[PDB]
């Protein structure tokens, strides 16, 4: 009926290995990128303090229908307190099974979840919390400021997820743009059967997820190399999800039985994440799951230097699909280049290689555009435009290195792949808008080269 996928890798790093989270993720990457997800059990004495008043934490609940292959929208950025939500969640689970809330086997919850989502007769609706930290509901990890206890030793931990949007080895930290949906940690309050649909993280980034407390979270993960296999399977069984959407807050995702994927030769792995354990998702690794009961998790995206080539591939993939970007990859690269003197040495080396590809591609695109008859040009500071004012009309990519404009359509832009998609004017009426000349870009790359040599 339901055949559980094989278990994903579980790591138990020693203290020395657990020290640098980025060094450890780099160490386990050859194993875990084969499974998409993996579990990290921290050293036994790594125990961050969790303290909260369940009566003063409020949040707006989200409602969720549990029907396989039904379209759901990705969460965007009525009221429960944490106590009243917990009482609702506990009464729901215990009444669903007629068993004490904490005595329902996890195997049975898994079997029952995949039964109810597939039965048209069942009409189970659950609720959950999902948002970034705010004054009414803050991070589960300690943050600076009133007076913190001596458990401020977890303030500067690499595994304190609030430090991920600031650590140097995360290239997302250097982004000046306000991408709070991606840079800041998300807080997830779950209950029995509340679920996250199959998805990958934006720009094919990593994510790391910590379960602060509560009943386990059940995960299904698919390695990054099988991403296109999974999408082809879902295109057959749910074509309505693959209709192009007007913006980022309209993306369609769904619940789907992993046995359906396994039947179509898609490798799927599972794990039960328990309180105090991390789950790490790797670039382009599809994942979904559900909560066994009342719990509280915190998750954040991040990008290592290993990710830089994949991040460029992803934006190219977004362009082919006409999907909106969260940020401009080229803007991030150039921002780091302009800070080459204070960059980590290994970061500088990796950024330099990506920038060399960027420059070669940009040079060829400008040659192609010049051969189409675009002659006039002017420097343009793309980073000053709001993101929705610098998307290619055709493919929706966020422009930064260059774009084409015509005075007959004020404010509209196309990227250099879509010069023919702007208007019916002859190309000599167009202007190439460019952030940098080639003569600006090579010294920027040389700064990274010099920095990479100590
Ligand atoms: O990558 C993710 C992992 C887990 C979750 C999650 N945990 N509990 N409920 N949902 C989640 C939610 C929204 C977006 N992404 C998510
Ligand atoms: Mn996610
Ligand atoms: Na159902
Ligand atoms: Na994608
Ligand atoms: Zn375009
Ligand atoms: Zn025109």
UniProtKB/Swiss-Prot annotation:
Distribution of this protein across tissues and organs: Ubiquitously expressed, with highest levels in testis. Down-regulated in melanoma and glioblastoma. Up-regulated in breast cancer (at protein level).
Residues that span the membrane, as ranges: none
Chain sites annotated for binding Fe cation: 199, 201, 287
UniProt subcellular location: Nucleus
Domain JmjN: 8-49
Zinc fingers typed C5HC2, residue spans: 392-444
Domain of life (superkingdom): Eukaryota
Every JmjC domain range: 153-319
Function text: Histone demethylase that demethylates 'Lys-4' of histone H3, thereby playing a central role in histone code. Does not demethylate histone H3 'Lys-9' or H3 'Lys-27'. Demethylates trimethylated, dimethylated and monomethylated H3 'Lys-4'. Acts as a transcriptional corepressor for FOXG1B and PAX9. Favors the proliferation of breast cancer cells by repressing tumor suppressor genes such as BRCA1 and HOXA5. In contrast, may act as a tumor suppressor for melanoma. Represses the CLOCK-BMAL1 heterodimer-mediated transcriptional activation of the core clock component PER2.
Family: Belongs to the JARID1 histone demethylase family.
Recorded disease: Intellectual developmental disorder, autosomal recessive 65: A disorder characterized by significantly below average general intellectual functioning associated with impairments in adaptive behavior and manifested during the developmental period. MRT65 patients have moderate to severe intellectual disability, developmental delay, and facial dysmorphism. Camptodactyly is present in some patients.
The protein's assembly and partners: Interacts with FOXG1B, PAX9, MYC, MYCN and RB1. Interacts with HDAC1, HDAC4, HDAC5 and HDAC7. Interacts (via PHD-type 1 zinc finger) with histone H3 unmodified at 'Lys-4'; the interaction is inhibited when histone H3 is methylated at 'Arg-2' or 'Lys-4'.
UniProt comment concerning the protein's domains: Both the JmjC domain and the JmjN domain are required for enzymatic activity. However ARID and PHD-type 1 domain are not required for activity per se but contributed to recognition of the H3(1-21)K4me2 substrate peptide.
Protein name: Lysine-specific demethylase 5B
Naturally occurring in which organism (per UniProt): Homo sapiens
Lineage: Eukaryota, Metazoa, Chordata, Craniata, Vertebrata
């Amino acid at each position: 009926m339901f055949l559980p996928p094989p278990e994903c890798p579980v790591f138990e790093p020693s203290w020395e290995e657990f020290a640098d989270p980025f060094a450890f993720i780099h160490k386990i990457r050859p194993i875990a990128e084969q499974t998409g997800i993996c579990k990290v059990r921290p050293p036994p004495d790594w125990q961050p303090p969790f303290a909260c008043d369940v009566d003063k934490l409020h949040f707006t609940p989200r409602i969720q229908r549990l029907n396989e292959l039904e379209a759901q929208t990705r969460v965007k950025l009525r009221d429960y307190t944490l106590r009243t939500f917990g009482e609702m969640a506990d009464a729901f689970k215990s009444d669903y099974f007629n068993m004490p809330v904490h005595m329902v086997p996890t195997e049975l919850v898994e079997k029952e979840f995949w039964r109810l989502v597939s039965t048209i007769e069942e009409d189970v609706t659950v609720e959950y919390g999902a948002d970034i930290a705010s004054k009414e509901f803050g991070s589960g990890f300690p943050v600076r400021d009133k007076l913190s206890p001596e458990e401020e030793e977890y303030l500067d931990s690499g595994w304190n997820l609030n430090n991920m949007p600031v650590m140097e080895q995360s290239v997302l930290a250097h982004i000046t743009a306000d991408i709070c949906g991606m840079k800041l940690p998300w807080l997830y309050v779950g209950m029995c059967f509340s679920s996250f649909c199959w998805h990958i993280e934006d720009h094919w980034s990593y994510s790391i997820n910590y379960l602060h407390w509560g009943e386990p979270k059940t995960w299904y993960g698919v390695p990054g190399y099988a991403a296109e296999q999974l999408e082809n399977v879902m295109k057959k069984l749910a074509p309505e999800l693959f209709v192009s959407q007007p913006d980022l807050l309209h993306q369609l995702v769904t619940i789907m039985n992993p046995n359906t994927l396994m039947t179509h030769e898609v490798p799927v792995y599972r794990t039960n994440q328990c309180a105090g354990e991390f789950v790490i998702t790797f670039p382009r690794a599809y994942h979904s799951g559900f909560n066994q009961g009342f719990n509280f998790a915190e998750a954040v995206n991040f990008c290592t230097v290993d990710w830089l080539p994949l991040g460029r591939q992803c934006v190219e993939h977004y362009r082919l699909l006409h999907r909106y970007c969260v940020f401009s990859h080229d803007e991030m690269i150039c921002k780091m280049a302009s800070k080459a003197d204070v960059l980590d040495v290994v970061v500088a080396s990796t950024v330099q290689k990506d920038m060399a590809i960027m420059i070669e591609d940009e040079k060829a695109l400008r040659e192609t555009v010049r051969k189409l008859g675009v002659i006039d040009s002017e420097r343009m500071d793309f980073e000053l435009l709001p993101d929705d004012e610098r998307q290619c009309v055709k493919c929706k990519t966020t422009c930064f290195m260059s774009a084409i404009s015509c005075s007959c359509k004020p404010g509209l832009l196309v990227c250099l792949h879509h010069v023919k998609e702007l208007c019916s004017c002859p190309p000599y009426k167009y202007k190439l808008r460019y952030r940098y000349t080639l003569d600006d870009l090579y010294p920027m790359m040389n700064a990274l080269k010099l920095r990479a040599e100590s």
